[PDB]
Amino acid sequence: GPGCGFWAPSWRVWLFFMRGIIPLLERWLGNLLSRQFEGRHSKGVAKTVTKQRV
RNA sequence: GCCCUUCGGGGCAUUUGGUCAAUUUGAAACGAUACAGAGAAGAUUAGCAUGGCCCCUGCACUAAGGAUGACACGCUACUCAAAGAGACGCUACCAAUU
């Protein structure tokens, strides 16, 4: 049942997950804020020829 | 304030900063309501694009979606003739039933 408080291994796991997730989310959130504060550039950087566009 | 002094003097430290704390008049946007109302030459519609002073959602400013996201569907002389054939064109208008 409940009573096991040996939490250091799982806590470790989530710290290392955070280590990897910081560069990805700081980039993603920075781009969220770029859209929010200067707007979306819609075209201009060219779109690739994907499968639906071949 | 402190320190030094040869008691005359000298030293240490040196220029912040975000338009006020004040919501009518220097800029928020839905929803409700009213209304209308969805592409491809009969009917019904899978979409993929194209162009940018149209954008939205998205990390994607090298996905995807938004009705195939929408827009598109008005308007329409102007580098501009030549041949040969006509013209009471360019003037006048005119005297017998028995």
PDB file of C-alpha atoms (C1' of nucleotides) in Angstrom:
ATOM      1  CA  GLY A   1       0.000   0.000   0.000  1.00  0.00           C
ATOM      2  CA  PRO A   2       1.086   3.592   0.613  1.00  0.00           C
ATOM      3  CA  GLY A   3       4.107   4.576   2.650  1.00  0.00           C
ATOM      4  CA  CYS A   4       6.993   4.327   0.181  1.00  0.00           C
ATOM      5  CA  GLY A   5       8.713   7.695   0.072  1.00  0.00           C
ATOM      6  CA  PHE A   6      11.917   6.638  -1.686  1.00  0.00           C
ATOM      7  CA  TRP A   7      11.383   9.252  -4.330  1.00  0.00           C
ATOM      8  CA  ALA A   8      14.899  10.142  -5.504  1.00  0.00           C
ATOM      9  CA  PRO A   9      15.079   7.822  -8.610  1.00  0.00           C
ATOM     10  CA  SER A  10      11.812   9.085 -10.153  1.00  0.00           C
ATOM     11  CA  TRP A  11      12.657  12.687  -9.261  1.00  0.00           C
ATOM     12  CA  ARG A  12      15.987  12.191 -11.055  1.00  0.00           C
ATOM     13  CA  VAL A  13      14.136  10.936 -14.130  1.00  0.00           C
ATOM     14  CA  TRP A  14      11.991  14.050 -14.331  1.00  0.00           C
ATOM     15  CA  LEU A  15      14.987  16.350 -13.881  1.00  0.00           C
ATOM     16  CA  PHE A  16      16.756  14.750 -16.856  1.00  0.00           C
ATOM     17  CA  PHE A  17      13.566  15.021 -18.896  1.00  0.00           C
ATOM     18  CA  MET A  18      13.544  18.737 -18.046  1.00  0.00           C
ATOM     19  CA  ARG A  19      17.170  18.999 -19.187  1.00  0.00           C
ATOM     20  CA  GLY A  20      16.180  17.790 -22.608  1.00  0.00           C
ATOM     21  CA  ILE A  21      12.901  19.680 -22.798  1.00  0.00           C
ATOM     22  CA  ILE A  22      14.345  23.163 -22.064  1.00  0.00           C
ATOM     23  CA  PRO A  23      15.940  23.878 -25.486  1.00  0.00           C
ATOM     24  CA  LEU A  24      12.876  22.553 -27.312  1.00  0.00           C
ATOM     25  CA  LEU A  25      10.244  24.433 -25.275  1.00  0.00           C
ATOM     26  CA  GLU A  26      12.230  27.635 -24.955  1.00  0.00           C
ATOM     27  CA  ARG A  27      12.453  27.663 -28.751  1.00  0.00           C
ATOM     28  CA  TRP A  28       8.775  26.752 -29.166  1.00  0.00           C
ATOM     29  CA  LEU A  29       7.540  29.298 -26.614  1.00  0.00           C
ATOM     30  CA  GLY A  30       9.816  31.924 -28.114  1.00  0.00           C
ATOM     31  CA  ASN A  31       8.204  31.335 -31.483  1.00  0.00           C
ATOM     32  CA  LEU A  32       4.749  31.428 -29.880  1.00  0.00           C
ATOM     33  CA  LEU A  33       5.711  34.846 -28.533  1.00  0.00           C
ATOM     34  CA  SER A  34       7.152  35.912 -31.905  1.00  0.00           C
ATOM     35  CA  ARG A  35       3.788  35.260 -33.522  1.00  0.00           C
ATOM     36  CA  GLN A  36       1.934  36.937 -30.679  1.00  0.00           C
ATOM     37  CA  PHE A  37       4.031  40.092 -30.687  1.00  0.00           C
ATOM     38  CA  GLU A  38       5.041  40.711 -34.294  1.00  0.00           C
ATOM     39  CA  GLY A  39       2.549  38.616 -36.246  1.00  0.00           C
ATOM     40  CA  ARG A  40       2.667  35.646 -38.573  1.00  0.00           C
ATOM     41  CA  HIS A  41       4.800  35.823 -41.748  1.00  0.00           C
ATOM     42  CA  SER A  42       2.515  33.690 -43.935  1.00  0.00           C
ATOM     43  CA  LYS A  43       4.345  33.059 -47.224  1.00  0.00           C
ATOM     44  CA  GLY A  44       7.866  34.128 -48.193  1.00  0.00           C
ATOM     45  CA  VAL A  45       9.964  31.304 -46.803  1.00  0.00           C
ATOM     46  CA  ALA A  46       9.197  28.834 -49.570  1.00  0.00           C
ATOM     47  CA  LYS A  47       7.122  25.742 -49.012  1.00  0.00           C
ATOM     48  CA  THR A  48       8.642  22.401 -49.892  1.00  0.00           C
ATOM     49  CA  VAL A  49       7.067  20.106 -52.469  1.00  0.00           C
ATOM     50  CA  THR A  50       5.319  17.634 -50.199  1.00  0.00           C
ATOM     51  CA  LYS A  51       3.419  14.539 -51.267  1.00  0.00           C
ATOM     52  CA  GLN A  52       0.142  16.408 -51.638  1.00  0.00           C
ATOM     53  CA  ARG A  53       1.852  19.025 -53.817  1.00  0.00           C
ATOM     54  CA  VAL A  54       3.952  16.810 -56.125  1.00  0.00           C
TER      55      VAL A  54
ATOM     56  C1'   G B   1      31.292  62.013   8.354  1.00  0.00           C
ATOM     57  C1'   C B   2      36.024  59.738   8.880  1.00  0.00           C
ATOM     58  C1'   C B   3      41.259  60.019   8.207  1.00  0.00           C
ATOM     59  C1'   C B   4      45.999  62.501   7.642  1.00  0.00           C
ATOM     60  C1'   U B   5      48.785  66.785   8.810  1.00  0.00           C
ATOM     61  C1'   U B   6      54.895  69.646   8.211  1.00  0.00           C
ATOM     62  C1'   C B   7      48.725  72.775  11.914  1.00  0.00           C
ATOM     63  C1'   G B   8      49.578  76.059   6.450  1.00  0.00           C
ATOM     64  C1'   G B   9      46.672  72.228   4.650  1.00  0.00           C
ATOM     65  C1'   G B  10      45.478  67.669   2.196  1.00  0.00           C
ATOM     66  C1'   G B  11      42.612  62.946   1.615  1.00  0.00           C
ATOM     67  C1'   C B  12      38.215  59.175   1.202  1.00  0.00           C
ATOM     68  C1'   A B  13      33.245  59.148  -1.596  1.00  0.00           C
ATOM     69  C1'   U B  14      30.642  61.844  -7.232  1.00  0.00           C
ATOM     70  C1'   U B  15      25.068  63.096 -11.125  1.00  0.00           C
ATOM     71  C1'   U B  16      19.691  57.998 -10.221  1.00  0.00           C
ATOM     72  C1'   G B  17      15.623  57.699 -13.306  1.00  0.00           C
ATOM     73  C1'   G B  18      10.819  53.094 -16.063  1.00  0.00           C
ATOM     74  C1'   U B  19       5.779  59.967 -19.212  1.00  0.00           C
ATOM     75  C1'   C B  20       3.124  60.447 -12.760  1.00  0.00           C
ATOM     76  C1'   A B  21      -0.381  55.824  -8.422  1.00  0.00           C
ATOM     77  C1'   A B  22      -5.484  58.847 -12.178  1.00  0.00           C
ATOM     78  C1'   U B  23      -9.491  53.608 -17.498  1.00  0.00           C
ATOM     79  C1'   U B  24     -14.832  58.958 -20.900  1.00  0.00           C
ATOM     80  C1'   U B  25     -11.282  61.647 -26.092  1.00  0.00           C
ATOM     81  C1'   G B  26      -4.812  57.869 -28.959  1.00  0.00           C
ATOM     82  C1'   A B  27      -7.471  53.065 -30.400  1.00  0.00           C
ATOM     83  C1'   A B  28      -8.923  44.901 -27.126  1.00  0.00           C
ATOM     84  C1'   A B  29     -12.144  41.177 -28.852  1.00  0.00           C
ATOM     85  C1'   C B  30     -16.000  37.753 -28.891  1.00  0.00           C
ATOM     86  C1'   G B  31     -20.769  36.226 -28.040  1.00  0.00           C
ATOM     87  C1'   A B  32     -25.962  37.199 -28.322  1.00  0.00           C
ATOM     88  C1'   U B  33     -29.540  39.522 -31.951  1.00  0.00           C
ATOM     89  C1'   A B  34     -30.769  40.705 -36.868  1.00  0.00           C
ATOM     90  C1'   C B  35     -29.950  38.983 -41.516  1.00  0.00           C
ATOM     91  C1'   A B  36     -28.396  36.255 -45.260  1.00  0.00           C
ATOM     92  C1'   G B  37     -26.029  32.105 -46.798  1.00  0.00           C
ATOM     93  C1'   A B  38     -21.012  26.787 -49.103  1.00  0.00           C
ATOM     94  C1'   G B  39     -16.399  25.599 -55.882  1.00  0.00           C
ATOM     95  C1'   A B  40     -15.617  22.852 -60.854  1.00  0.00           C
ATOM     96  C1'   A B  41     -20.391  24.641 -68.021  1.00  0.00           C
ATOM     97  C1'   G B  42     -27.667  19.096 -65.393  1.00  0.00           C
ATOM     98  C1'   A B  43     -27.503  16.841 -59.990  1.00  0.00           C
ATOM     99  C1'   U B  44     -24.319  15.767 -55.768  1.00  0.00           C
ATOM    100  C1'   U B  45     -19.079  17.055 -54.534  1.00  0.00           C
ATOM    101  C1'   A B  46     -12.594  14.291 -52.935  1.00  0.00           C
ATOM    102  C1'   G B  47      -9.351  17.585 -53.219  1.00  0.00           C
ATOM    103  C1'   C B  48      -4.018  19.891 -54.793  1.00  0.00           C
ATOM    104  C1'   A B  49      -2.413  24.423 -56.246  1.00  0.00           C
ATOM    105  C1'   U B  50      -1.726  29.560 -58.146  1.00  0.00           C
ATOM    106  C1'   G B  51      -0.968  35.581 -56.670  1.00  0.00           C
ATOM    107  C1'   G B  52      -0.551  39.080 -52.269  1.00  0.00           C
ATOM    108  C1'   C B  53      -1.643  46.221 -49.408  1.00  0.00           C
ATOM    109  C1'   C B  54      -6.550  39.042 -46.969  1.00  0.00           C
ATOM    110  C1'   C B  55      -5.274  36.367 -43.178  1.00  0.00           C
ATOM    111  C1'   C B  56      -6.490  32.640 -38.771  1.00  0.00           C
ATOM    112  C1'   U B  57      -4.871  28.014 -35.725  1.00  0.00           C
ATOM    113  C1'   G B  58      -0.070  25.829 -35.234  1.00  0.00           C
ATOM    114  C1'   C B  59       6.870  25.096 -32.726  1.00  0.00           C
ATOM    115  C1'   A B  60       6.676  24.645 -38.093  1.00  0.00           C
ATOM    116  C1'   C B  61       9.684  31.761 -41.074  1.00  0.00           C
ATOM    117  C1'   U B  62      11.363  24.275 -45.079  1.00  0.00           C
ATOM    118  C1'   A B  63       4.263  20.170 -41.494  1.00  0.00           C
ATOM    119  C1'   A B  64      -0.893  20.156 -41.509  1.00  0.00           C
ATOM    120  C1'   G B  65      -5.572  22.380 -41.256  1.00  0.00           C
ATOM    121  C1'   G B  66      -8.896  26.549 -41.678  1.00  0.00           C
ATOM    122  C1'   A B  67     -15.576  25.514 -47.316  1.00  0.00           C
ATOM    123  C1'   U B  68     -10.280  22.642 -52.158  1.00  0.00           C
ATOM    124  C1'   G B  69      -9.505  28.908 -45.784  1.00  0.00           C
ATOM    125  C1'   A B  70     -11.295  32.981 -48.430  1.00  0.00           C
ATOM    126  C1'   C B  71     -10.548  36.438 -52.551  1.00  0.00           C
ATOM    127  C1'   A B  72     -10.888  35.100 -58.430  1.00  0.00           C
ATOM    128  C1'   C B  73     -16.498  35.229 -61.923  1.00  0.00           C
ATOM    129  C1'   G B  74     -16.495  43.119 -63.304  1.00  0.00           C
ATOM    130  C1'   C B  75     -14.790  45.619 -67.292  1.00  0.00           C
ATOM    131  C1'   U B  76     -13.667  45.492 -72.681  1.00  0.00           C
ATOM    132  C1'   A B  77     -12.619  51.725 -79.112  1.00  0.00           C
ATOM    133  C1'   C B  78      -7.218  53.757 -79.320  1.00  0.00           C
ATOM    134  C1'   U B  79       0.701  50.748 -82.650  1.00  0.00           C
ATOM    135  C1'   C B  80      -4.916  50.547 -87.023  1.00  0.00           C
ATOM    136  C1'   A B  81      -6.175  50.710 -92.644  1.00  0.00           C
ATOM    137  C1'   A B  82      -6.153  50.103 -98.008  1.00  0.00           C
ATOM    138  C1'   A B  83      -8.304  49.183-102.775  1.00  0.00           C
ATOM    139  C1'   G B  84     -12.676  50.326-106.470  1.00  0.00           C
ATOM    140  C1'   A B  85     -17.667  51.553-106.990  1.00  0.00           C
ATOM    141  C1'   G B  86     -21.393  54.735-106.614  1.00  0.00           C
ATOM    142  C1'   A B  87     -23.107  60.186-104.961  1.00  0.00           C
ATOM    143  C1'   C B  88     -30.005  66.608-108.888  1.00  0.00           C
ATOM    144  C1'   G B  89     -22.140  65.778-103.604  1.00  0.00           C
ATOM    145  C1'   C B  90     -20.219  71.609-104.619  1.00  0.00           C
ATOM    146  C1'   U B  91     -26.598  74.263-108.785  1.00  0.00           C
ATOM    147  C1'   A B  92     -31.163  75.274-110.331  1.00  0.00           C
ATOM    148  C1'   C B  93     -36.056  73.540-110.095  1.00  0.00           C
ATOM    149  C1'   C B  94     -39.220  74.202-115.733  1.00  0.00           C
ATOM    150  C1'   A B  95     -46.680  76.893-120.092  1.00  0.00           C
ATOM    151  C1'   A B  96     -54.526  72.954-121.512  1.00  0.00           C
ATOM    152  C1'   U B  97     -59.584  69.259-119.568  1.00  0.00           C
ATOM    153  C1'   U B  98     -63.004  70.583-124.577  1.00  0.00           C
TER     154        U B  98
END
